[PDB]
Swiss-Prot record, chains A, B:
<comment type="function">
    <text>Transfers glycine to 5-phosphomethyl-2'-deoxyuridine (5-PmdU) to produce 5-Nalpha-glycinylthymidine (Nalpha-GlyT) on DNA as a step in the pathway leading to thymidine hypermodifications in the viral genome. As a final result of the pathway of hypermodification, 5-acetylaminomethyl-2'-deoxyuridine (5-AcNmdU) substitutes for a subset of thymidines in the viral DNA. These modifications probably prevent degradation of viral genome by the host restriction-modification antiviral defense system.</text>
</comment>
<dbReference type="GO" id="GO:0016740">
    <property type="term" value="F:transferase activity"/>
</dbReference>
<keyword id="KW-0808">Transferase</keyword>
<keyword id="KW-1090">Inhibition of host innate immune response by virus</keyword>
<protein>
    <recommendedName>
        <fullName>Glycinyltransferase</fullName>
    </recommendedName>
</protein>
<dbReference type="InterPro" id="IPR040741">
    <property type="entry name" value="ADDT"/>
</dbReference>
<dbReference type="GO" id="GO:0052170">
    <property type="term" value="P:symbiont-mediated suppression of host innate immune response"/>
</dbReference>
<keyword id="KW-0899">Viral immunoevasion</keyword>
<keyword id="KW-1258">Restriction-modification system evasion by virus</keyword>
<dbReference type="Pfam" id="PF18724">
    <property type="entry name" value="ADDT"/>
</dbReference>
<comment type="similarity">
    <text>Belongs to the thymidine aminotransferase family.</text>
</comment>
<dbReference type="GO" id="GO:0099018">
    <property type="term" value="P:symbiont-mediated evasion of host restriction-modification system"/>
</dbReference>
<keyword id="KW-0945">Host-virus interaction</keyword>
Amino acid sequence: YEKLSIEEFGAHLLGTVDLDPIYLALRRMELPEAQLNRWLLAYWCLYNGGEASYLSEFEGREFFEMLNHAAENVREAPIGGRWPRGAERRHWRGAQATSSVEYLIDRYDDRPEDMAAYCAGQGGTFLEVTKRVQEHRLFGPWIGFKVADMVDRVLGKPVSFDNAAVFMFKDPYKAACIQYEVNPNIPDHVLADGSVAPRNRELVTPETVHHVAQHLIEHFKGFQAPPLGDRPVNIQEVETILCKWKSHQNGHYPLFKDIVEIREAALPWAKVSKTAQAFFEAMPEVT
Amino acid sequence: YEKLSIEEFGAHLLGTVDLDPIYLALRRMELPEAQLNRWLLAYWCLYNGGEASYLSEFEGREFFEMLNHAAENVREAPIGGRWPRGAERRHWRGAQATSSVEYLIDRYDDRPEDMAAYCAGQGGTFLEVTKRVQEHRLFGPWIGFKVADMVDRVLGKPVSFDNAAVFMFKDPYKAACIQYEVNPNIPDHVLADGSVAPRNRELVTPETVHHVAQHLIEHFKGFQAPPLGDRPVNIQEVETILCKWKSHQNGHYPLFKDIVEIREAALPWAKVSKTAQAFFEAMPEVT
């Protein structure tokens, strides 16, 4: 496929809501609060939205029993075969996953819905929200970041991200370094010595990475952020644009990749769950 | 024992270095860099300084073998009996602890010393340092906080703490609420409505908790922070003063508690390890 500039690639992610289609799907579903919180907990464990939908309809201790079936992954999933994991939570397996569920049972007993409620709180700083996520067993900084984004984009509670919270992560850091090297629309960055940062991803320092981020934010702020266009795009969406663009220019993100692969993974679940059928209908589509 | 004001209790912690005596012990030992990093990793797992000292002398994959003995806790510790945990890491046990060691072996192979080096980096914000700690399996926000403090106080690399990073934790939050209720030296806090916060720990909001913190920082800034008095006391030391004071007024922290209990736990290790003997000699003493 043709490799696009980050400007054109970002504009496509934003206009099709391929940027983070799950967030629009969930907003469309308008799930009741407790079920939404159970959906989110399941999704934060397994990172599969159709699977999360199926699990979200179980309540109380029964929710935690079914989640425990997925953790152990010995019994057959309702779609046949094993209980899948999105690559982001591939490591939620074996004794680590069952210990993760046990932590949750001991903390929340018959109220699994309180987990997302506690994480979300009233929003807050990125530091405060990820700390509350990361209290939980097998919830590390990467899922912490994702939950913070979803507390804002899905649950509507603002979480203040800044450039340091994003570029402490290796992948958006490396994407920003490539962008300085290869994007002629980004001006030369003048460092603290009047020296100019050279166009070489391996020599880019944090200072230039923030220069790249500020440029891209300024570029994309004329777009309203998905799922529903409630505020101008900020570093939360630019982070996703940067990481998906890095995959794109590496040959690993054709247009619509997220939408297509979610719908592919979610369709088997629609047969076995009314919520999963609603989730499949709510997903944005190709073109 | 007599319950002291936080002003008098804090002045005692600071002058005797009962505030965090381990930090002064380590500074005195002047361990070589690689051994210091191994000591710190062991201490961050088990939270026992004499045990950490013993483990710090093993090198390479052998360090990780010995740490794995402590994780499994089936073989006898060199002091007889089980491999102890400080209460802060009591949960570092069973399959969780052995999975924690396995993560470390896979990440650092024969260079266990790189772990503390990676965490410390060049210092930075509290968010950046705790994120790097919390990448590691079974390293949550509480040990993340402790490591950030030690990266500054022990490894000499400044970590910027602010009031939000401290009072997102339940214990210093509750200590600050008690302090507003019971300390007449803290002035009435005027809230955003011209209303005054009442003297009742159960009604204290984050805004008043920060009012308490600012007051205590202003109070204690005429003290130089331990271990060596390199800068005025800040929220890192006030957090410890607040939490130990809360225990003190609850009957659970007589003067010198930390020094006395460390020396008690560390002495058995001095017989079986030259570093543990140095650690015992380096600990500050009662009076």
